Design a protein around this ligand. Sequence first.
Ligand SMILES: Nc1nc(=O)n([C@@H]2CS[C@H](COP(=O)(O)OP(=O)(O)OP(=O)(O)O)O2)cc1F
Ligand SMILES: [Ca+2]
Ligand code: NA
Ligand code: NA
Ligand code: NA
Ligand code: NA
Ligand code: NA
Length: 324
Amino acid sequence: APQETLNGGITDMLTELANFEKNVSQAIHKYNAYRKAASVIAKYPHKIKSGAEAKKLPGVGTKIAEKIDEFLATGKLRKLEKIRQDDTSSSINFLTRVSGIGPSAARKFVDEGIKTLEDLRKNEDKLNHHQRIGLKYFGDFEKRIPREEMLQMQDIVLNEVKKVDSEYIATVCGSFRRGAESSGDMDVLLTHPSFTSESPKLLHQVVEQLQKVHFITDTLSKGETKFMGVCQLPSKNDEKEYPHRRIDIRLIPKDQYYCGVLYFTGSDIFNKNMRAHAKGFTINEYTIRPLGVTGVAGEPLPVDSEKDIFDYIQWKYREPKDRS
DNA sequence: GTCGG
DNA sequence: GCTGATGCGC
DNA sequence: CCGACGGCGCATCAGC
Ligand SMILES: Nc1nc(=O)n([C@@H]2CS[C@H](COP(=O)(O)OP(=O)(O)OP(=O)(O)O)O2)cc1F
Ligand SMILES: [Ca+2]
Ligand code: NA
Ligand code: NA
Ligand code: NA
Ligand code: NA
Ligand code: NA
């Protein structure tokens, strides 16, 4: 992609606006509007000279064009400069960095004068379990995970899953599967021949084994098909500890596995494109369905490889590396 | 906020 | 007790 | 003008 020195001032401005819309205004559609605009501008291979120029791009409209004109004329946006100074809004925005504190919790905290991590720390009884864990690992959860460490993590997960039952299949998806040099977390998809579209404790026994070997250290949420938690690589006799990392584990039916793998591999942006580009078809995380004459989705087609799904749409098979 | 019925 | 709604992360 | 904009699983809240 183009160098960030091209339009980084504009992209950074739009992303900061997007965050205030999500976290303070609770205006999720304006957050996505600003993100879309920032993304289309990030990809534009020219230094923008005017709001009119940017307005030609899809997702940039009248108001972002006007903001780009103020930014180019002054190096700032009055509106952003003001909200950055605002103790209430800045504090709400900041607290949403804690995993489990969304815009609603953040506002409620700030309204009670709880505005900093220090205030959260003093008020543990006002936090739910997930929020306590997000606070405990605030710094670690914002660190990226080098690929080297992801491989070590993958080694542990695959070894322990097979130890519980050698018929499991486990696949690390997300940016790792796309060969990224670092990841934000570990996404694991799990299946087992006994669990299909029509069919005990298959997710639990895996989570329990990873806990028994002290890889999984905390649990954010855990149901029959989705686990969200925290893990940590072991360190040698005295290296400093590794950071705690986020890990998800999803149990998916065997006959929907490849649609699962495709979906959770991503990127989010690739999937949107692959879905939008689907001829008389609709693809979700579970299935690929042929749309009828009226646009109604019919029955799921059988799938025994990611490629089958590319075939159905006559889409040129991209490998995970090329789904960016 | 942007798009498009 | 329970159902359904909302918040949340992704 | 005005509605769509992603949808899922789990934790927790609101209310019967
Ligand atoms: N909000 C999201 N909704 C999605 O459907 N997705 C889908 C399902 S998961 C897949 C991309 O996965 P992630 O969200 O794990 O992001 P990633 O692994 O590509 O990136 P990162 O290394 O986790 O930062 O695309 C992603 C989202 F972030
Ligand atoms: Ca991920
Ligand atoms: Na609002
Ligand atoms: Na435009
Ligand atoms: Na948060
Ligand atoms: Na109810
Ligand atoms: Na993820």
